[PDB]
């Protein structure tokens, strides 16, 4: 490596001297704790180390060395249902060796080196490959796990061992170019694997949560933010999103969060049962969690790990979930490193790197097409936390640029408890001019109007409320008061939802389209009805609205059972009017 | 259709330019064994030393060392390694270490006379 030692210390930072010809940003084992730092500044013989391992009582003179390589992941199977924290280290083992805490400086391998796996070579000796193709599969859960050749690695094949039980350790395929391709390989995180070309959106991505999807859906590539103050769902809706999918694997970060904040999250997972495999849903999930008593800077590392996993799996044909918990952390991180390198921070105190890197973080995801001609798409859904509790800080506001659509939340709804608290006079979508193909393909064409035809309602709900509280609903007439309880239903059976209800736990387009016709009716009937000299009082009392008020209950199977059931009752009861 | 026509043409001209390049490469690689190789030595040797306002010593293949007698008299003399088509040198201190590879001379002129060749060529 290179030898040298310490020079001065400042909290998470330390400077080091005598190192020279050293590389830029590396695995820097520092101290006899051996702390993996990173060279941010390279100045003369004087190296800034930058730990991700909590400091305490170092001195001056301890050895400092460095690989001369950045930071990358052991790849292979065994990933699902694993822990890796932010610095890749797998808590599993740690948990065991270190009692009951987290203790810095304890080092282990990441991915296991003892586990056996059946091997099916899909390659033969003397063959020729290309960088990113598959060499062989491995049975992992309900998955065709594959060993994708690393980038810029190709050539003839010297041998191929036949089937067997192995650890990822051995090369099964040594190239006829003298290249022993072991299963895992090294791909530095701060970069992205390329793809043969990129495939593009036109396919909906559903987490199935009603309103969320139905009003402002997102596509399967895409990008979106979540912001709002503490309280409305942010911290925990995401958990819930995981419990359903329109995707395969589920890769979950977490940063700066507290242990209790992710407890259940872990342990419940085996009871969750995906229905797209029927599996116990922990089998396709990833713990990349981070405490909140790590170095500020380890909330950098942590983020990058996720996404770099995502591609790997995605190139293995898959639909990937990344659900970024709080960029605020990350922010703060860099905000701290600043102090160290002493830079005039841009307004509100941040480095003006800011959205530099952010920008790229969003890009990398999406649906693509690989060398292997496989599909897979990365979906990302990021959360934010500005102090005041809204757009009023650049770190949130500029986040709104490099993105697709966003999912606003606000305090006020959180008080009266409407989970989620989306301000539906908030957010926008940016795909609903291109999700219609798949729409009138599964629902049927009468979704592409009628949905919109719900919107008009709440548009017009706004415009009147204003005056309602300014005078009273009283000096307003029937048709006015119409929409008032239209809107009402749009909340009663949408906005108000739970993620605790065994029933509304998962919901779908059928229920969607379902109530999408239900409501329609009242309108269309009543519009004529109140012009039958009828008073809206009475129309409010017509119990059939009350019936639809049980809408969130029909467990979604026997859903057209009750659809059609009450369908008639509408055209029944109202034939009096 | 037009786009295919354009590509085709430009592509083709690329075949041309590459050949012309190749011939230079071939030619430049044939200069040592053209008898004018000692002649060539000091042209470039003097040339680099002139460009280095400092002086220290020159460094080159032992091959071309003989051809140079001039700055075998002058300089500190430390005529070593290989700069091999080109001549290298270093002036005072480690500093800047200005050289003159013949192949870098192609690349220099290329960046210029990319334009001129095309005029000569298609006409």
């Amino acid at each position: 490596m290179i030898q040298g030692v310490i020079q001065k210390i400042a909290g998470p930072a330390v400077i080091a001297k005598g190192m020279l010809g050293a590389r830029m940003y590396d695995i820097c084992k520092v101290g006899e704790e051996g702390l993996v730092g990173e060279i941010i500044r390279l100045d003369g013989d004087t190296a800034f180390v930058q730990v991700y391992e909590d400091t305490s009582g170092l001195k001056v003179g301890e050895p400092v060395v460095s690989t001369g390589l950045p930071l990358a992941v052991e790849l292979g199977p065994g990933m699902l249902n694993g822990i890796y924290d932010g610095i890749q280290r797998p808590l599993e083992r740690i948990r065991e060796k270190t009692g009951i805490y987290i203790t810095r400086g304890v080092v282990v391998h990441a991915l296991d080196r003892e586990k056996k796996w059946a091997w099916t070579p899909m390659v033969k000796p003397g063959d020729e490959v290309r960088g990113g193709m598959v060499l062989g599969t491995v049975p992992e859960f309900g998955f065709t796990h594959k060993i994708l050749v690393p980038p810029d690695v190709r050539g003839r094949v010297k041998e191929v061992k036949p089937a067997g039980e192995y650890t990822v350790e051995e090369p099964v395929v040594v190239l006829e170019d003298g290249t022993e391709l072991k299963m895992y390989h090294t791909w530095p995180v701060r970069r992205a694997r390329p793809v043969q070309r990129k495939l593009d959106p036109n396919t909906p991505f559903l987490t199935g949560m009603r309103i969320l999807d139905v009003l402002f859906p997102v596509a399967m590539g895409g990008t979106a933010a979540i912001p709002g103050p503490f309280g409305s769902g942010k911290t925990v809706t995401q958990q819930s999103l995981a419990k359903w999918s329109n995707a395969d694997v589920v890769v979950y970060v977490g940063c700066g969060e507290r242990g209790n904040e992710m407890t259940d999250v872990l342990v419940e997972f085996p009871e969750l049962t995906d229905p797209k495999t029927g599996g116990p849903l922990m089998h396709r999930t990833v713990l990349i969690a981070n405490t909140s008593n790590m170095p500020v800077a380890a909330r950098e590392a942590s983020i990058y790990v996720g996404v770099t996993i995502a591609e790997y799996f995605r190139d293995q044909g898959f639909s990937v979930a990344l659900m970024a918990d709080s960029t605020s952390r990350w922010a703060e991180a860099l905000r701290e490193i600043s102090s160290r390198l002493e830079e005039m921070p841009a307004e509100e105190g941040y480095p003006p790197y800011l959205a530099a890197r952010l920008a790229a973080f969003y890009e990398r995801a999406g649906k693509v097409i690989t060398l292997g001609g496989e599909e897979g798409a990365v979906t990302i859904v990021g959360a934010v936390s500005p102090p005041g509790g809204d757009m009023s800080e650049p770190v949130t506001q500029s986040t709104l640029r490099i993105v697709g659509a966003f999912w606003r939340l606000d305090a006020s709804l959180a008080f009266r408890r409407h989970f989620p608290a989306i301000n539906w006079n908030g957010s926008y979508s940016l795909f609903t001019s291109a999700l219609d193909p798949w729409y009138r393909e599964n629902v049927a064409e009468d979704y592409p109007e009628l949905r919109d035809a719900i919107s008009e309602l709440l548009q017009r709900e706004a415009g009147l409320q204003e005056i309602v509280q300014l005078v009273g609903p009283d000096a307003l007439q029937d048709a006015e008061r119409l929409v008032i309880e239209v809107g009402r239903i749009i909340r009663e059976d949408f906005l108000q939802q739970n993620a605790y209800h065994e029933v509304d736990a998962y919901c779908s387009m059928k229920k969607a389209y379902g109530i999408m016709k239900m409501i329609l009716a009242f309108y269309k009937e009543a519009e004529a009805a109140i012009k039958r000299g009828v008073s809206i009082d009475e129309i409010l009392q017509l119990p059939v609205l009350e019936r639809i008020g049980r809408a969130r209950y029909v467990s979604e199977e026997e859903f057209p059972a009750y659809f059609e059931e009450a369908m008639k009752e509408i055209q029944g009861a109202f034939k009096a009017l | 259709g037009e786009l295919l026509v354009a590509t085709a043409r430009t592509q083709a001209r690329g075949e041309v330019l590459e050949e012309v390049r190749r011939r230079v490469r071939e030619a430049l690689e044939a200069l040592p064994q053209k008898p004018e190789w000692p002649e060539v030595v000091r042209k470039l040797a003097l040339e680099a030393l002139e460009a280095l306002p400092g002086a220290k010593a020159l460094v080159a293949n032992p091959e071309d060392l003989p051809h140079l007698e001039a700055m075998a008299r002058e300089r500190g003399v430390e005529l070593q390694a290989e700069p091999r088509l080109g001549v290298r040198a270093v002036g005072a201190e480690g500093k800047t270490q200005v050289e003159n590879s013949l192949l870098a001379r192609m690349d220099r002129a290329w960046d210029a006379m990319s334009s001129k060749v095309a005029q000569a060529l298609w006409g």
Partner: protein
């Protein structure tokens, strides 16, 4: 050739090396690695003792033993040719399609020198852009500076593209048309999402005007710094096509917001005291030097049309960026956030959109001279309206008297009818017409801004 070694500091896109003596403030140099792969290099501060190099890449794995610089040129110039249209380039300016590196004809500096006012000739032609908004009120004169203010998550791009396909001169009011003119554009962004990208492309091929165009593309994922290089690079591709090749090129800028972002970085990370609200002060210059290039010179058949589009956060026109832009620039057309989610497209409306170049010989003379004053009526006409947007919400359903009722009645009307255009195209006349039709609901004798003839002429 030359050859420089002796690093001293690396940290952020700022480099340091001594023993320079004949380096040029702003010079493209190289950065040979040890791995073997070159990186860029600007001389953004030569000094007697050391100097600043400006890494156009990031640095990674970089060392203190093989980091080797080589002055490529003193200044950045670039070649160009006519024949290179439909090709792709990037911030560096290497071709991206895979076809030959261009053969220049003439190289020319990139920073340029500015115009001479004597050499400029006043604008005087305008085009039909296909949306009334502009095309009635503000009048997009040829070779103008028009910024289109938008916010995120608004239809920023789309609307731009429309213009690109409906942009066309008017022979009718003259004797000269596209039987005397072809047409063309040069587009670049400076990094964007992917989603905006492809979307873009499909409107050039289906128009097919792609061929006769130039693309520079930086994608929002390349080294950040090359955000500040790129504009100019393309911008010199404008004069070149304008003056010796002679053309009618629309040049489009979008993502300038992000321009300055990066700008800032070098700005302050190196040093300079910030020159206002978290930005450097020469920001002004840097955004002068970009926009200023437009216009036409005497007797030339070029046309340097700058159309920038960008978005500041919120809608504060007072947020730094559009700020100064305003002074600098000329045009000013706004999206209107409010209109957006009430479904009217393009949401552009005058609420502070306030043109500039209008009076100078278009929308009149050659054009109907029952246009100018039309506009002006409508202007205040709208005023008179919307005032009451508040007063209504204060008094009650109504307490206003009968006449003034009409005001509000035409407001709501106007917006809905007039301002909504589908993928439509309304000719300048088809437009205009409507205008008098909206003047209809106001009785005469309230319209007091246009002569007696005109008023009845088209009532």
């Amino acid at each position: 050739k030359k050859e420089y070694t002796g690093i001293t500091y690396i940290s952020g896109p700022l480099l340091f090396v001594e023993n320079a003596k004949d380096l040029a403030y702003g010079a493209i140099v190289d950065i040979k690695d040890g791995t073997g792969r070159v990186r860029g290099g600007q001389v953004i501060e030569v000094s007697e003792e050391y100097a600043v190099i400006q890494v156009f890449e990031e640095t990674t794995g970089l060392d203190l033993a093989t980091t080797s610089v080589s002055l490529v040129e003193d200044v950045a110039r670039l070649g160009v040719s006519k024949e290179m249209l439909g090709r792709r380039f990037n911030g560096i300016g290497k071709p991206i399609d895979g076809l030959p590196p261009i053969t220049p004809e003439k190289r020319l500096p990139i920073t340029g020198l500015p115009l001479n006012p004597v050499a400029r000739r006043k604008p005087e032609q305008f085009i039909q852009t296909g949306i009334s908004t502009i095309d009635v009120m503000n009048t997009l004169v040829r070779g103008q500076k028009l910024p289109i203010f938008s916010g995120s998550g608004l239809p920023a791009n789309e609307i731009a593209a429309q213009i690109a396909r409906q942009a066309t001169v008017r022979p009718d009011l003259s004797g000269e048309g596209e039987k005397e003119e072809p047409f063309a554009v040069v587009f670049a962004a400076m990094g964007i999402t992917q989603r905006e990208l492809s979307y873009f492309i499909q409107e050039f091929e289906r128009t097919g005007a792609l061929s006769r165009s130039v693309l520079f593309l930086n994608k929002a994922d390349d080294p950040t710094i090359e955000r500040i290089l790129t504009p100019r690079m393309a911008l010199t591709v404008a004069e070149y096509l304008a003056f010796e090749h002679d053309y009618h090129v629309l040049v489009i800028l979008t993502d300038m917001t992000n321009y300055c972002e990066a700008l800032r970085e070098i700005g302050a990370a190196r040093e300079e005291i910030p020159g206002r609200r978290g930005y450097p002060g020469y920001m002004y210059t840097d955004l002068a030097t970009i926009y200023e290039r437009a216009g036409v010179v005497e007797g030339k058949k070029g046309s340097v049309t700058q159309i920038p589009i960008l978005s500041m956060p919120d809608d504060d026109r007072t947020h730094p960026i559009p700020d100064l832009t305003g002074y600098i620039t000329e045009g000013q057309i706004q999206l209107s956030r409010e209109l957006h989610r009430k479904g009217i497209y393009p949401p552009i409306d005058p609420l502070p959109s306030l043109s500039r170049l209008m009076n100078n010989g278009v929308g009149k003379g050659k054009t109907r001279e029952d246009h100018k004053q039309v506009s002006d009526q409508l202007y205040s006409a709208y005023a008179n309206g919307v005032d009451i947007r508040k007063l209504v919400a204060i008094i009650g359903e109504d307490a206003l008297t009968e006449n003034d009722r009409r005001y509000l009645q035409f407001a709501d009307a106007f917006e809905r009818f007039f301002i909504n255009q589908g993928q439509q195209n309304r000719s300048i006349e088809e437009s205009l017409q409507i205008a008098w039709a909206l003047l209809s609901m106001l009785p005469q004798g309230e319209l007091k801004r246009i002569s007696k003839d005109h008023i009845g002429k088209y009532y």
